[PDB]
Each structure stands twice: as C-alpha cells, then as structure tokens.
Design a protein around this nucleic acid. Structure first.
Ligand SMILES: [Mg+2]
Ligand SMILES: [Mg+2]
Ligand SMILES: [Mg+2]
Ligand SMILES: [Mg+2]
Ligand SMILES: [Mg+2]
Ligand SMILES: [Mg+2]
Ligand SMILES: [Mg+2]
Ligand SMILES: [Mg+2]
Ligand SMILES: [Mg+2]
Ligand SMILES: [Mg+2]
Ligand SMILES: [Mg+2]
Ligand SMILES: [Mg+2]
Ligand SMILES: [Mg+2]
Ligand SMILES: [Mg+2]
Ligand SMILES: [Mg+2]
Ligand SMILES: [Mg+2]
Ligand SMILES: [Mg+2]
Ligand SMILES: [Mg+2]
Ligand SMILES: [Mg+2]
Ligand SMILES: [Mg+2]
Ligand SMILES: [Mg+2]
Ligand SMILES: [Mg+2]
Ligand SMILES: [Mg+2]
Ligand SMILES: [Mg+2]
Ligand SMILES: [Mg+2]
Ligand SMILES: [Mg+2]
Ligand SMILES: [Mg+2]
Lengths: 155, 226, 206
RNA sequence: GGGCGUAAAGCGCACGCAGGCGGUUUGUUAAGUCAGAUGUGAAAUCCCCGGGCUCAACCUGGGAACUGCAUCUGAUACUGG
RNA sequence: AAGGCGGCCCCCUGGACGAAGACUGACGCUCAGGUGCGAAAGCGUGGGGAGCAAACAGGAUUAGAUACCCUGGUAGUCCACGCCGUAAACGAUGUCGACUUGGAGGUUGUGCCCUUGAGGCGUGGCUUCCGGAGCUAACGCGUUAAGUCGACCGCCUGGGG
RNA sequence: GCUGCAUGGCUGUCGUCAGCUCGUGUUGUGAAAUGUUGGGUUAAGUCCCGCAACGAGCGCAACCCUUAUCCUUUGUUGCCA
C-alpha cells in the first residue's frame, strides 16, 4: 500500500593486495503517501541485493510530517553537510517543482504542491538528508498552539 | 520506600567531585569532602512514580529485563529477577543483544538444544573428547545468555543499574524504543534514560533496596492481574 | 601456490577409481592403453551425449564400460542400435568382448563435468563468462549444492592479457578429507585463445 | 543570496584623521520612518475581463498596473538633531 | 601590540593586574588614506673581529659531484649612526563587545576560616591540556571558539601566465 | 621453426607463513570502519578475558598414511614354549 522508489545507484571500490574490490550502493526513499517518509542506504556486490538492503533500512527509521493539504505548512529550509535545501508550499495544482532526489522524497511523502530548490552540493545522499531534516523541523498550528499556549485563533 | 529508608541505606552518596556530569545539577545537593549528595527529596517522588508506571507496564503481562554487569550486585540482580519470575543479564551485556536479536536467538536455540540433548537427554557418544568441550560451551552460553533463554521476543522494558556503565544497552533500548528504568549516578548521563532514578549503585544494601522495590511492584502487578 | 587434485588426494578414501581392474606388470600398460583408447574414442563421438563419467571394468574374460551421463536417450538410440555399434567398436579396441551399462544422472548440475562442459561450450557460442559462471552457480544452489566454486581463467573477453576470475558460494572444505568434493576440469577453444574451467562441488561429508 | 584555521582569501603589528556604528533616562524637534489625501506617473506595450477578422497570430473597449516623484495634513514607538 | 626580550648590579623609563574607596560623566568601538614600530639576510660610513661561517681553495665520495663528509677560509655575524620594510612576520585563526554545560594544571594577586600547623573555603588577571552542546567537507575548534550574536575594517572569486 | 610479454594445463617462490573474508548489528554524510583491535597465550586469527559487536566461512587443527602398545580373528609359503 505504501510507495517505495530508488534514488540512485553508485559503484564504489576498495582496493586490496589482489586489486580492486567493486561494490554497489543504493539510496532509496519509502513513504506511505501521507507524510510518513523514510530513507534507506545499503551496500552489496549486486544491484538487487543492494537495493533490497536499502528497502528494509528505509522501513525502519520512519518519520512523521504534519501536512496541511498535500503541501507544506510553511516555507522550510533544510541544511546538511554540503547541501542547502529551500522548500516552500505552493498553490493547488502547481505540482512538484524540485530536483531529482528531492522530488522522489517529496512525492513518496505525500506533498503534491511544492516549490523546492537545491543550493550547495547536489550529492543525492546529502540532499535526501537535508530534505528529511526540513520535513522534521516544519511544525503544525495545533502543536504551535499548545507550544505557545494561545489556542488556534492564529489561523 | 521512604525518605528514611533510602537515607539509612546510604544511597545519598555520589561520586567524587572530579567525576561529575554537568547534567546532574538538579539532583545534587552539595559536595562534602569532595562527595556529592543526591537529593532524596527529589529522587523519591520520581522513584515512586517510575515504580508506578512499572506496575502499569507489568499489568500488560510484560517482560522486564534486569541488566547489571557490575560485580557488586551480580548475585543481587540474579535472585531478584528469578524470584519474581522475570529475566536478567548479569555476566556481560553483549553488544547488539537487543538490535541483533535474530543472530542472538540462533545462539540461544543452540544454547537451548545442548542442555536438553546432553544433561537431561542422553550421555551416549562421549568419545571422551568433546564432552568437556561441549560442557564448557554450555557454561559459556549459560553465563552469557542463560538469563534470556525463554524470552522468545524483545523485552517490554529495561531496568538498568548504571546508565553510563551500560550505555550500550541504553542506546540499543533508545533505538528500539524500549522504555528504560535506569538508576543514574553523579558521573552518569541521563539523556538516553527515559525514567531516571537518581541514587547510588555502589552499595549492596542500596541495590538490594532498589531491587526490592521493583520486585514488590512487579509481583503486585501479577497478583492484581490475577 | 598450487593445489593438490581433490579427486586424486581423496581417491583412496571416498572417490571410487574410474578403473577398478587388476593384472600383473605383463599387461598393465597394455590394458592402460586400451582404457585410453576407449575413453578418448568414446568422448570424441559422444561430445554431444553429455558424457560425465566413464568407469572401465575388466572381468577376467571381458571389459565392462559404465557410462554415467545425463541423456541416455541419445546414447542408446532407437531400440539400442547405437549401443550395439559402440559395442562392436569398443570391443574391437581391446580385442575382447565388451558389456556396456548406461547409468543416468538425475541432477546434471551437481556433477562437475556437466557444469564444466556447459560453461566451456557457452564460450565458443560467445556467451559472456561472468554471466555464464553466475548461471552455473545459481543452478547448483537451487538444485541443492552445499558448496560451489567456479574458476574461469585465460584471455577473458578478447583482452590482450589473461585474467583470473573465480566466484565461490556456499562451502568448499578442500582440506577436509572426508568432505565429498566432485571436481572436474574442462577447456574452451575460442578464437582468442584457450580457456580453462574448474568446478568444485561439495555435497556433504563422510 | 557566498566566503576567508588547512581548499582562493585576516594587512607583520599598532596608533590614528575622515567615514561607519554607538550605553541609559526625561523633554523637545519632526530630518529619516509610518498613515491619509491631492496632483502627476503620455499613448502603445506587459496583465485581467470582454469584442471583431471563419480559428489563430493580429486588431481593439474598459480595467488593473506603472506604489516612483512632489506637495499638504497627521503619528512620535525606533533612528537622527 | 607584534617583531622579540636570559649572567649580576646601578641610572632613566613604558605597560599590565589585584584590594578598598574617591572622582569625570558616553569622553566609546572600529578604521580607507596617513603615521610609527617591525626577525634574519642585505646596503652606506667609521670601528672591531675570539668563535662560527656564504663565497673561494684543496682532499675525498661519485659514472660525473660546481653538493652532502674533511681540512682551511673572506664577506657577514659584534658596536655606533643611517637605509631597507621583507619572513611558514603562523594560532596559517582582524579588532572590539555580549551570551553559552564542565575537569585538571601552571603563574600572579587578594578576602576569610580553631589563622593552631608543613590545613581548607572564596575571589580576580594571565596561561596549557582534555572534553560536552553546538559548529565544521573532514581533520578538528570547543568560555582564550572555528559555538550564539552585533560594530567596523581587510581580503577572496578555477589551475597556470 | 618464432612469440611463455597472447594463452590453457602444470610447477617454483615467500611458506605450512597465519592469514583472507562474509552475513546481521552498530559507527561514519560517505568511501568505509567494527568484527580482525587490546591483556595474556599458543605451533597457529589456538584459546581465554576484555571489548559494539553477535555469529559464520575459507585457511590452523581434525578426518587419510606410517611408526610406537595391547586385545580379538586365519595359520602357510611364515613361527617352534
Ligand atoms: Mg603442492
Ligand atoms: Mg564560494
Ligand atoms: Mg597550500
Ligand atoms: Mg590558503
Ligand atoms: Mg595575524
Ligand atoms: Mg541611542
Ligand atoms: Mg518626516
Ligand atoms: Mg502608460
Ligand atoms: Mg642584522
Ligand atoms: Mg655592514
Ligand atoms: Mg666547511
Ligand atoms: Mg616569528
Ligand atoms: Mg607578506
Ligand atoms: Mg598570512
Ligand atoms: Mg585600533
Ligand atoms: Mg579540545
Ligand atoms: Mg609467466
Ligand atoms: Mg556489516
Ligand atoms: Mg547509518
Ligand atoms: Mg588481517
Ligand atoms: Mg578491518
Ligand atoms: Mg583495523
Ligand atoms: Mg591479541
Ligand atoms: Mg602452522
Ligand atoms: Mg580459526
Ligand atoms: Mg575480540
Ligand atoms: Mg590441516
């Protein structure tokens, strides 16, 4: 019922006394389509084995995101080691406007309308981390209402 | 459980003022002759409620695992667990004992098979060679995983006798979302701990007092369920 | 370094000799040559018959040849016409009458000759070696191999320099004597050279 | 809407004029700041709602926009005097 | 302040920090240009020259050895007065101010406690080491920040050229 | 007849030296790390203790051969209390 898709696959190497030892890495994102999204990173000698490992890694380490209506509550800015991510909620019907890694993360999470831009490095492993960081730190008016002790007359 | 009971048992001692954790300030009264004092007026009320929710977790037919590897309270934690029919670890907390439960269970079935086919089973085929080897494997697995042989699953909650000295267990519990009931000393770190119990753990009479409180609660849970 | 032949080392223990006949020094080399003639002639014209093992027996007044193969239908023909022609020629090779007993192997992929000859044959049919070795390994594990190891070496992929390529799944306890390792070696004659293929199959101990 | 320990990048160090910035309270001013109004900001163009070439490009009515400037009146929290 | 400063004594002289008050009353921070200071080497004039030692000479080494090694050896290193204004002039980290968990030292003041004592409790200045949160590409920095922030100045914009 | 510097097969060498790896877990943004390090011990990555590691595999060892002791079985072509 939940959706899963593969971000990128990369071949890595570890040289030994005999020579190189080739390996394959898989970055995947798993989301239920509501705002519960996670990512998994796995390593294996074979591409099917590597992608499978990332699949179970993503089912654990799931997070929850509070969405308004298929979109973000407010503009959000997610920063990881070398990647800067700016996402802001857009109007209905505008669709998803984001880079490769961010679009997959966003679409499996369940955000249909969003304007998202990536600054800094565009390494898939780090932009996915930055995107997850933004969806965390974004908040909901009811949790803010309890946070400030001011009820929900703000909106 | 009371003010005077813990004071008499001497749980109010903490470590030296050279080993303290700046996160312990709310739970330190003063330092006398470079010995911190843990405020009983603060630890008792949260000790009682932590014991209270321990009763609630036991009410759901839970599995409570008593983790202590210090030589101070080895026999202390073992008898307290067995008396209340709960499970324990005493020799040494194996890294990945919670997270890597599948491989651990493989060792446990291996452990389980050997007693029933050697001791209460048959003593044939000794060959006089591997008998000592096989009994030694039994003893190694008995001290290591003997206390968790029957669990067949993940613990519902953990009771930890030192947060800092079993931080590996604490981080695995946090990763797996297992509630933590840990006693924290001056030199420990309570961040990973979920229901902190400020108190001493270097005293046999103190640790038996603390294990007696948890034992009374869990048996009350069982009897209340009955 | 170099390895002992796993069949040869365990020949006296668990591996039945291909030749299980006795005589004196007078006809030792003579009947050894006859076994060579029989085996090479048999293999050359049963290259398609998936011949795996040839067991030559010499009862006191005849020769018996047991052919362990995977395709008895081809090696017998219709009503046994082919086995009688092989009888004529094989008997004339050694100058004595010959009995032929054909034994079938239900699992070809667990015998080291069929897997080796198949991998070799794919090379001159221009199948890429990495996929070929992987196909063999997967077949063995599915059909119940306890351990597998395949060695394809020499002029891989038309390169200038020969490379060694091997891939091991499961369990191959060569140094264990009671271990049952069926080993065979086969060769591939390709337009860019000649390729050696080695297969170890472990199928339990004692 | 970027950086400067090691990737390019902290003057060798300091004093110091111009300049930039400036603790805290009261009064006053109203220069910055903000609000209102008035006059301008040509038409075409761009955008919105329509109209006519059989459609379309194209042409075209109204509107919005051109929030920029200037003046007058007012507010005094912050900056400045 | 940096560059730097090491026998002892005397003369002249600058800054720093601590204790308890008194006093002025925003007189402050930063700083383009400008000015001043600025290791060693070097330059000018006049001295001095023990040791050391560019250059240079000889002897080895080496296929060669305009070097490394050895024996010597002039400038220079030393002083006075000018000039030079450059260093991996480095903490490779501009100055000023505020805030943010800790621990052990060193060094210099200073208030107390039966000052009994060859004993402890406080408070400052400066200074090393380790490390928390945080930050960082990472190494690491971590109350003396590369953390959280403000003021101003300098600088950077691919590698060569 | 040429090219082992196109190769297969086979062999020498360090060296019978004790190493070479994987699964799951954990760590690291990541390549990867950990396991395999450390206190000892062993002929040995042999074993033990500690240890974010828990196990597992190929190698070490064991199974094969011979010699060292005894018991039982058959006694000629071997032995003679
Ligand atoms: Mg050999
Ligand atoms: Mg830049
Ligand atoms: Mg450089
Ligand atoms: Mg630089
Ligand atoms: Mg500097
Ligand atoms: Mg002011
Ligand atoms: Mg005004
Ligand atoms: Mg106009
Ligand atoms: Mg000089
Ligand atoms: Mg001079
Ligand atoms: Mg010299
Ligand atoms: Mg210097
Ligand atoms: Mg310079
Ligand atoms: Mg510099
Ligand atoms: Mg200044
Ligand atoms: Mg540090
Ligand atoms: Mg060669
Ligand atoms: Mg792993
Ligand atoms: Mg990870
Ligand atoms: Mg190793
Ligand atoms: Mg390693
Ligand atoms: Mg290592
Ligand atoms: Mg060791
Ligand atoms: Mg050895
Ligand atoms: Mg081993
Ligand atoms: Mg270990
Ligand atoms: Mg061996």
């Amino acid at each position: 019922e939940l959706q899963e898709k593969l971000i990128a696959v990369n071949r890595v190497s570890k040289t030994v006394k005999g020579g190189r030892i080739f390996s394959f890495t898989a970055l995947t994102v798993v989301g239920d389509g509501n705002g519960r999204v996670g990512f998994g990173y796995g390593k294996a000698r074979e591409v099917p084995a590597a992608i499978q490992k990332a699949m179970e890694k993503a089912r654990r380490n799931m997070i929850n995101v509070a969405l308004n209506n298929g979109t973000l509550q407010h503009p959000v800015k997610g920063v990881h080691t070398g990647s800067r991510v700016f996402m802001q909620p857009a109007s209905e019907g505008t669709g998803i406007i984001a880079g490769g890694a961010m679009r997959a993360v966003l679409e499996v999470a369940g955000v249909h309308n969003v304007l998202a831009k990536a600054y800094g490095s565009t390494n898939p492993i780090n932009v996915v981390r930055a995107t997850i960081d933004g969806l965390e730190n974004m908040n909901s008016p009811e949790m803010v209402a309890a946070k400030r002790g001011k009820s929900v007359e703000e909106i | 459980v009371s003010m005077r009971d813990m004071l008499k048992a001497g749980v109010h001692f903490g470590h030296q003022t050279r080993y303290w954790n700046p996160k312990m300030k709310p739970f330190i009264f003063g330092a006398r002759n470079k010995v911190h004092i843990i405020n009983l007026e603060k630890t008792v009320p949260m000790f009682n409620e932590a014991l209270a929710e321990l009763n609630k977790i036991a009410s759901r037919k839970g599995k409570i695992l008593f983790v202590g590897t210090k030589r101070a309270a080895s026999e202390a934690v073992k008898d307290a667990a067995l008396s209340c029919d709960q499970f324990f670890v005493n020799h040494r907390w194996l890294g990945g004992m919670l997270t890597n439960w599948k491989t651990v269970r493989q060792s446990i079935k291996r452990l389980k098979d050997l007693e029933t086919q050697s001791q209460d089973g048959t003593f044939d085929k000794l060959t006089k060679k591997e008998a000592l080897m096989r009994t030694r494997e039994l003893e190694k697995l008995e001290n290591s995983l003997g206390g968790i042989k029957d669990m067949g699953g993940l613990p519902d909650a953990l009771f930890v006798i030192d947060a800092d000295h079993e931080h590996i267990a604490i981080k695995e519990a946090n990763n797996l979302g297992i509630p933590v009931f840990a006693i924290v000393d001056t030199n420990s770190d309570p961040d990973g701990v979920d229901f902190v119990i400020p108190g001493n753990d270097d005293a046999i009479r103190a640790v038996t007092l603390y294990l007696g409180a948890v034992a009374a609660t869990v048996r009350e849970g069982r009897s209340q369920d009955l | 370094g170099q390895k002992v032949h796993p069949n040869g080392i365990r020949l006296g223990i668990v591996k039945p000799w291909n030749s299980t006949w006795f005589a004196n020094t007078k006809e030792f080399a003579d009947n050894l040559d006859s076994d060579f003639k029989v085996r090479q002639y048999l293999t050359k014209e049963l290259a398609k018959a998936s011949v795996s093992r040839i067991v030559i027996e010499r009862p006191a007044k005849s020769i018996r040849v047991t052919i362990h193969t995977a395709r008895p239908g081809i090696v017998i023909g219709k009503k046994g016409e082919d086995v009688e022609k092989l009888r004529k020629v094989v008997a004339d090779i050694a100058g004595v009458p010959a009995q032929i007993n054909i034994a079938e192997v239900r699992k070809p992929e667990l015998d080291a000759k069929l897997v080796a000859d198949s991998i070799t044959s794919q090379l001159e049919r221009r199948v890429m070696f990495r996929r070929a070795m992987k196909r063999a390994v997967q077949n063995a594990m599915r059909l119940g191999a306890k351990g597998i190891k395949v060695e394809v070496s020499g002029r891989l992929g038309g390169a200038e320099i020969a490379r060694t390529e091997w891939y091991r799944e499961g369990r191959v306890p060569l140094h264990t004597l009671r271990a049952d390792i069926d080993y065979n070696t086969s060769e591939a004659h390709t337009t860019y050279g000649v390729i050696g293929v080695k297969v170890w199959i472990f199928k339990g101990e004692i």
